[model samples]
Target: GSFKLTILHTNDVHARLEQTSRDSGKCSGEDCYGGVARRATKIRQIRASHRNVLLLDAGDQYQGTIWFNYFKGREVVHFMNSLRYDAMALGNHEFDNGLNGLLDPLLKNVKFPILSANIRPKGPIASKISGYILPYKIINVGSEKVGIIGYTTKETPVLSNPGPYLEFRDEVEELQKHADKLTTLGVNKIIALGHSGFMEDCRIAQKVKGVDVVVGGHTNTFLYTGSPPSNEVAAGNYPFMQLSDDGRQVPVVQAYAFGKYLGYLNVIFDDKGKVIKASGNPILLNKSIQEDPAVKAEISRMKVQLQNYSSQEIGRTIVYLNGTTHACRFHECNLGNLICDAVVYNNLRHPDDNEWNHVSMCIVNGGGIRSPIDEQANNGIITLEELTAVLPFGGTFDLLQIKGSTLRQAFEHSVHRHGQGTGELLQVSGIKVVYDLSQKPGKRVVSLNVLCTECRVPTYVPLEMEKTYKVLLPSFLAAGGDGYYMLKGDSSNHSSGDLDISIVGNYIKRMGKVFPAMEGRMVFSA
Candidate 1:
C-alpha cells in the first residue's frame, strides 16, 4: 500500500521578516525574494490542495538582521504560529544568547513543538523546558502514523553560547535511540529533522536504520533536481537519495538558508516505512508569488520602529561587497577582505599602545558575513541596516597572542574541506598563503608569508614558527567556532571588548568609502 505525504519545509530563515534582494539584503522591490507573506501564501495554497500536508522548519530562526536585533524571538514566533508550522528543530544560533534570551515568548507562546533530541536541559532550562521542547513528535496522517525526530549540532559549546547548564549529546547516537523507540511504538514511518549540516544528515540516512527521510540545515546546502530556481548552484539533487544500513532508501533535503526558497518534498512511503518515491524542488520565493495580506500587515506594523534608526547612511562603497557564501566560503572575497581590514584598522585605535600597534594581522571566518553591498545599491551608500545585515552576529574582536606555528595549523583547518563551501575558511588581512588543494588538508599550505610586527616599517617575511604575534579577530573564531580548535589555547585581551560591527562602521567612516579587492592573499592549486 502507498501513503502520500506533502512536506513543506524551510531552514535557517535567520529573521528575514521582509522580502530580500538576491544577495539576501534590502529588497528594491523590482525582483525581491522570500519574506513571510509569500511563504504564508504558498503554504496556504499547498494545504488547500494536499490532504496529507506537513509544515516544518529546521531551526536557525535566530540572528542575522535588524529584526533579530530588536525583536529577538518574538517576531519569529508570531510569524511561525501564524504560518502554523507543525514542528521546528533547534539550530546552534538559538543558543547564541545563552539560556533565557529567546525564551520569554518563544517556549511559552510557540504553538508547535521546538525540538532537540541530543540536548538535555541542565540549569534553568531543565525545569521550564521539559513540558514544551520535545525530542520527537508523532503525527497521524490518515491511517498511518509518522514519527519525526529532532536533533541539533553537537558543536553548540564552541559555536554559540548555550550557557554552562546545557548538555549536548551526539546527534547520531540520540537519533538512533529515538528512531528505535518510535519503531516499537507501532510507528512505521520516520523522518529525521535536524540542523547538523548536509554531510551529517546523509550519514544519518546511511547509518540510522529506522530513519526514512532527512530534512536538515546548518550548512544551508541548496539541493535542486533540474534547473535551480535561483542563481545558487545546487549542492546535490533534491531529496538526495541515500541507502540505509537496513537497505532502505532514504531521501535527504535542505533548503538553502534565508527564506529564499521553500523546500517541497512529496514522498510516498510503503506500509513498512521505506520511501517508494521521492521528488520535489525548493520553490523559489520570487516576487511572482503573492503575499498573504495578514503577514504583510504584521510586517508593516513591525517596520515602523525600525525605519528611523536603520535609515541613517553610515558610509559609501566604490565596489560591491561580495558576501555570497559561494565567494566568501570557497575562496577570497572582497567583502571578507574589507571586514578583516576594518578589524585591523580598529586595532590601531590607540597607536601609542605598543601592543596594539603590534597587531599586524586579522582573520575572520567567511561564514560570519550575512549580506553584501551591490555596486549599484543606493549608488554605493551604506545604511546602518545594510551594515548590520552584513555581520549580524554582533561578535566582538579580541587581540590574541599566539605562536606562528599555531597560526599555520589554524590555516590548515580552514582549508580542510577545500572547495566544499565550508564556513571554516578564513578570510584574512596582512598575510598571504598558497595552498595545494590537490594535496592533503593538514599539509595543504605550500607556503605562508607573515607581515612583520616589530620591523621599523612592517613588511612580509617568511614565518618563524617559534615567534609569537598579536592578531585581532572575532571572538567566535578566537573562541573556536567552526571547529578552529587550535585557537583555543591562545590568550586573548578580553579588555578591549570593542564590537566587531562598530569596527566596520568606524573603518567605513574613516575611509569615507569601502573598496576592498582580492589581493591574492590565498592561492589554491585545485
Candidate 2:
C-alpha cells in the first residue's frame, strides 16, 4: 500500500439543525441524538487529526425537517458550505420541490460541485442545473491524485418530484462509464459517492473497474461490525467487501440517514489503484461528542430569524402521537389518523359537507410518518418544529379519480406485507378495512368499506367494485412510490392542495388540542 486517506462522510442530514429529542422531535437536553452542530464538531476534530482528509456527502441533504418547510433548502447550502463539503451526490429528496428547489438554494449557493453522473438534465433546466453537477471530480491529495464520481438511484423519479427536468440512467452502467474516464485521467484511487441504496452500492462496487470505495445512502441502511450505538440495527458489516472482476477488494460504506452517524472510512491504496486495506466504523453523534460552538451559534441565529410565529406553540395533544417507524409501518397509528384527517380536511371537494370530507377516501403511506411527537417536555404543546418532524417532507398531494377495482387492488397491496415492516402498508381515511394478513398477498383484505361522500345518505357501505371514486394521494404514492403502482394514473388530474405541514398545522391550530383515537378504520384480526 502506497498511501492512506481519511474520508469523513455524511448522508441524508435532512435539515436536522438542532439535535432531536429522545423521541426524535425537538432537541431538549444531553439525551438528544444528532445535529449539524454536533456533526461539525466531529468533522472538525477528524480534520485536525488527519493530514489527508476529504469530506464527501452521499446525497439527500433535503427534506424531513422544519427548516425545509420555511426555506426549500437554504440550510443545506448554508450549513454544508460552512462545513466545507468537498462534493455531494443527488438524493431523490433533493428534487422534493423539483428543479427550482436546489436550483436556487444549492445550485446557486453551493461552494462545491453536486455530482450526479446518471442524471441527464433535459427539458428547460438542461443548462441551468446541469453546469453545477460535475460528472467526476479529481482532487490532488499531496502527491496522489484521487477521483470521486457520483451516481444516483434510477428510482428517483418515482420517489420524488424531479418532473420532466431530470432523467436517470442505470447507476452501475453509468459508474463504469465514469470509472473509465477517471482511470484514463491517471487517478488511481477512485471513490464512488452517491445515494443508490445498499444493494445497488454492493452491485456497483463489484461491477465498476476503477471504484475503490462505494459511499452510499438513500435506503438509510445502517452498517456496523460492532453492536449499533442507537436504535438503528446494522444491515451488514461496515465497509462490506466485494470482490471485483479484476481481483480488487472494493468496500461499500453507508452511515445510514440523518446526522445520527458520521462515516469514518480509512483506506490504504496499493500502487495499482486497488484497495489493499480498508477498515472503519460510523461514529455515533451521541452526547459524548460536543457541538461546534460557532456552528451551534449560527443555528441559534437562524432559529431567531425564523420568527416566533412559525416556531410558536400551536396546539397541545394529550396522547403521544405514535409516528415511529415501527408503529406506523406495522400498526394503525394515531399520528397517521391525525394526518389523514388533516389531508382530508384540507382538500374538501364540497366545503358544505363539513361532517364528512367530500372525497371517497384519503390514502397515506405509513412510511410518510417520519417521527413521533412526544408529550413530555413542553407539556404536549405542539410547535411547528414538532409537527414538521412528523410530516417532515412538506410534501404535496393531489385528489385522483381512481377506479373501485384499482382502490381494492391498492388495499390488497397495502396488507400484503404486514408483518415484514415494509412502509407501503396504507393508512386511510373516509374508509374502513378489515384484513387477515395471514392470508396470501392479493387475498389479505377480508372486508373493505368506503364512506360515500357523494351518495345522498353519505354513510359507510360495502365497496362496489364497478364504481368510480376520488381519493387524496400524496406526492410519493401519487408517483407510485413505496410500491403503490396500482394507484399510478393520469398526472394531469392533480387536484392540488397546501403543503402537508401547512395542512396539518392549520388543522391543529383550529382544533386547539387533538386526541385522535384508534377508530377501527383499519383493523386486523379484531
Candidate 3:
C-alpha cells in the first residue's frame, strides 16, 4: 500500500501582495508577475485537482513593501487565511518588530499555526503567542499519518529582534528530538518545515533519521526540476536528494521569494511511511496566470488606503539603486554607499552638538536593504514605494565611540564572508578601505583610511589604533544584529530618534538630483 501527498508551498513572500512588474518590482503597469490574488487562485486549483494536498509556507512573510510598513503582520494574516495555509514555519523577519509586535497583534490574528521547534518562549511570550505556535503538527492524509516538524534558525537572535526570554536552541538537535517524539507516536512519515537556509535544509535532510522531506526558506533559494522559466534561475534540482546518515535518501525543496514561485512536490510513501519517490517543479506565477476575483477585489480595497502615499515621489536618481542580494552582500554596492553616506550626512545636521560632530563614518549591513531600486521606470525617477522597498525595516541611526582596535575587529568580521556573498558585508561612508580577499578573512584589510571630517578638502588619514572615533551605524547593528556583537559596547553610545529611511531621504532630497557612484570607497584587491 502506498500513499501520495501533494505539497503546495511558498516562502519569503516579504509582503509582496500585489501584482508586480517582473522588470521593476512595482505594481504592474505593463508586463508583470506575482500577486497574492493569483497565488490564491493557483493554490485553490491545485487543491481541487489533488486529494491530500498540504499548503505550507516556509516563512519571512513579513517586511517588504508599504503593505507591511503600514499594517504590519495583519496584511499577511488576512491574505494567508483566505488561501487556507495548512501550516507555516517562523521566519527570522517574523520577529522584525520585536516579540510583543509579533505576539499580541500579529500572530494572534493568524488562523493557522506558526511552528518553530527551537524557540521556547517563557514568561509573557509563552502565555501569549505559544498557543498557536507548535513545535510539530500531525496531519492525517487518507490512512497515512504525516508529522511536520518546524525549525527556525538559531541565528534569529543576531538577525532579528527576538530579545531575552525566548530561548533558541540548536536547529538539528531540537529537530531530532521532535522527530524522535513523532516516531515514538507511530508517525514515520516526517517532514521538516524549517526557515533555516537551503544549505542547512540539506544538512537536516542528510543528518536527521526520520525526516523524509525538508521544506525550507530564509536564503530564498530557487530549486527547480528542469529549465527555470522567465527571469528566474535554478539554484538546484526540484527535490534535491540528500543521503541520510542511516542510508535513507531524503528530499529537500524551497520556492523563491516574493510570491513569484510556488513549490509543488508530490511524494509517494510506502505503507510503513518511508518515502519511495518524490517529484515536482516550482510553478512560476507570471502574468500568464489569472488572479482570483474574490482575492483581487479584497486586495483592491486594501490598496485604496495606501495608493496616495505609495505614489508619492521622494527623490530622483539617474542610476539603479543596486540592492540585489548578490551585489549588496558580496561587494560594495551603490545603494549601500549611498545609504552609509546618508547616515554620516544626517549626523552632521546637528553641527553644534559635540556628540554628532565627533562622528566620522557610518557602516551598514547589506542585508538591511530588502530590494533593488528599479531605474527602468520613467527615466530613473525614485518614488516613495521604491525607497520604502529598499529600506523597509525602520532602524534608527546610532553614534557610538569604539577604539580604533575595536573598529578593525568590526571590519574583519564584515569581510569574513568574502568570495561567498553574505549579508554581513559592511558598506561604509567617510572612510576608504582596501582589502585583499586572496588573503585570509580577518587579515583581508591591507589599509584603512578615514576622511578628515573637519578638513576643507576631502582628505584621507591613516587610523590610529589607540584613538577612539565616533562612528555612525544603524541601531540594529549597535544592538548586535548580523554577528557584529562587539559593536554593542556600552558607556559611549548616543542613539538617534530618526529612522534610517528619513536619514537617507534627507540626503537624497538635499542633493536634489542624486547619482551616488561607487567611487572606490571599498576597494577589493584581487
Candidate 4:
C-alpha cells in the first residue's frame, strides 16, 4: 500500500503575530492580511483532512515587529506551542539576541526540538543547547519511517550574533552525512529541513543524493504554481523539483515571510520507500481566512500592553523612507541616506576634535534596515513603533579608522552583487563613489572621492591610497557581520556609545521635518 504524508511549513515569520498591512506583503489594498491566528486555523483544517501530517517551520521566528521588541522570543514560543510544530530548523535570526538570550528564555522554553545538522558549538555553548538541538529525527508515518534532517545557513556568523565558539560546516556534506546515517537505520525516505536561502536550497537538492525534500528559508522566497498573490511576483513554482546525480527527483519548497503563506507539500511513497509523486501549493493567508478566536484573543491581550510605547510619536518625515529590502539591497534608497546621515549627525553632536580627527564617512548595511516609514500613515508622521520596527536590533554606532585601500575593498564588496539585490550593499554619507559593474566583482569601483570637510563649498577630493580615514558605522558591521571582514581588525575602533535607532530618531527630531533624498553618493555605470 502507498503511504501519503503532508508537510505543512512556514519560514522567516520574524515575529509578526498580528495581521500585516498591504505594505508588508499584500498589494495596494484596504484589506489587512497575514497573522498566526489565521495560519493556525489553516493548519487545523489541513490536519483534519490528512491522517499523516507533519507541521514544520523552516526558521527565523524572531526579530521584526513590536511583538518581538516587547516579549523577545517568549511570544514566539507561545504561538509555536499553540500551533504544535513538530520540528523546526534554526534560522540565522534565532541568534539575534546572542547565546544566553536564546538559551535562557527562547530555545529553552520552546516545545519542539530545534535542529541544525551543520553547526557544532564548543564548550559552554554546546552543553547549554544539549537536549534542544539534534541532527535528524525519524517519525513513523503510516508504518513507514520518514527521516527529517535539519540544516541552518553557514553564514550565521556573518548574518547574526552567533559568537566565534559556534563552527558552521558545509551544508551539503552535513546533510549527506545525516542522510547516510538515517539510511543505515533502515529509513528509506528522508527530508531536509533547511534554513538556507532559495539558491542554497536548489544546490542542496541537486547535491544531496538521499534528501527527498528541502523545505527552505532565509531569502523569504515566495514559490507558488500558477498565479501569485496580488502585488507579489512568484519566485518560482511551489515544490520546485531538482534531479539528483543518481537520477532521483528531489522537491524543494518555501513559503513567503511574515506568516503570509503556508506551504503544503504532499508526498506519496511506495511500499519500498521511494517518492512516487510530490506536489502542492502555498496557501495564502489573505483577509478572507477567518482567524482562530482563541489565538486572536491571546494576541489582543498582548497588544494592550504594548499600545502606549508602540504608539508614542518619534518624529516626522516629508517623504517616504524606502527601507524595502528589494530597493535598499540593490540601490541607494532614501532610508539608507537617512540612516547613514543620522550616523554622521550623531557623531557631530559630540564635537570631540580628537575623536572627529579624520572622520570622513559613515556606512551601513541595507539588511540592517528592517522596515519602511510609510508616507501614507498619519500623513508622514513617524512613531516609536515604526522606528522600532525599522531598527529593531538597536545596535550602537561605532567609529573606526581604515586605510583608503581598505575602504575601496569594502566598496567593491558592497557593489559586487549588482543587479541582484544583496543585503551586503553599503549605504554611505560624506563620500562619492562610482562603480562599473561590467568590469568584474573586485574591480567594479571605477572612481572614489572623499568629502573635503575643510573646504567651505562642500568640496570633493579623490581618495589618497596612503591616508587613513575615520569612519562611523554600526557596531554590527564594525564587528565584521555581513562579510565586512576588513572592518573588524582595525585597531582604531572606538565605541560611539549611542544606539543607532536613537541617533536616527534624534536626527529626525532635531531636523523637525526630514526629507533625505538619494544624492548620487553611490553611482553605477550603465
Candidate 2, RMSD to the unseen true structure: 9.9
For this target, which candidate reaches the highest lDDT against the unseen true structure? 1
Instruction: For each candidate in the order shown, give its overall lDDT on alpha carbons.
Output: 0.82, 0.81, 0.80, 0.80
Candidate 3 lDDT: 0.80
Candidate 2 Cα outliers beyond 4 Å, as residue runs = 308-526
TM-score of 2: 0.69
Winner on lDDT between 2 and 4 is 2
Which tens-of-lDDT digit does each residue in 301-371 have in candidate 4?
98898786467666788898999998788888899888888877655432223333235578888988888
Model 3, residue 263: C-alpha shift (Å)? 0.7
Best by TM-score: 2
Model 2 per-residue lDDT tens digits across residues 296-345: 89888888877764768889998889898888888788889888898777
When summed lDDT is taken over every stretch of 10 residues in candidate 2, the lowest stretch is 349-358
Q: Comparing 1 and 3 by lDDT, which wins?
A: 1
lDDT assessment of candidate 2: 0.81
**TM-scores of all candidate predictions against the true structure:** 0.67, 0.69, 0.67, 0.67
| Residue 395 shift from truth in candidate 3, angstroms | 15
lDDT of 1 by residue, 230-328 (tens): 799998899899888877779999999889999999999887777899999999999889988989998998999778647867789989889999999
lDDT score, candidate 4, position 26: 23
Q: What is candidate 3's lDDT per residue for 1-526, written digit by digit as tens?
A: 8999999899988778888766326653766778898898889899888989998999888766667766778888888888989889998778877777788565778787788998887658655666668999998777678899999977665455676567778888899999999999999899999898888899999888889999999877888877778777787888888889989889899998889888899999988888899999988887788999999998899989777656766678888889999888888889999998888775553233223244668888887888887777776776666777888765567767788888888888888886576688888898788888888768988888987655555577888899888788887788888889988945234432235776677687788778878888888887
What global local distance difference test value does model 1 have?
0.82
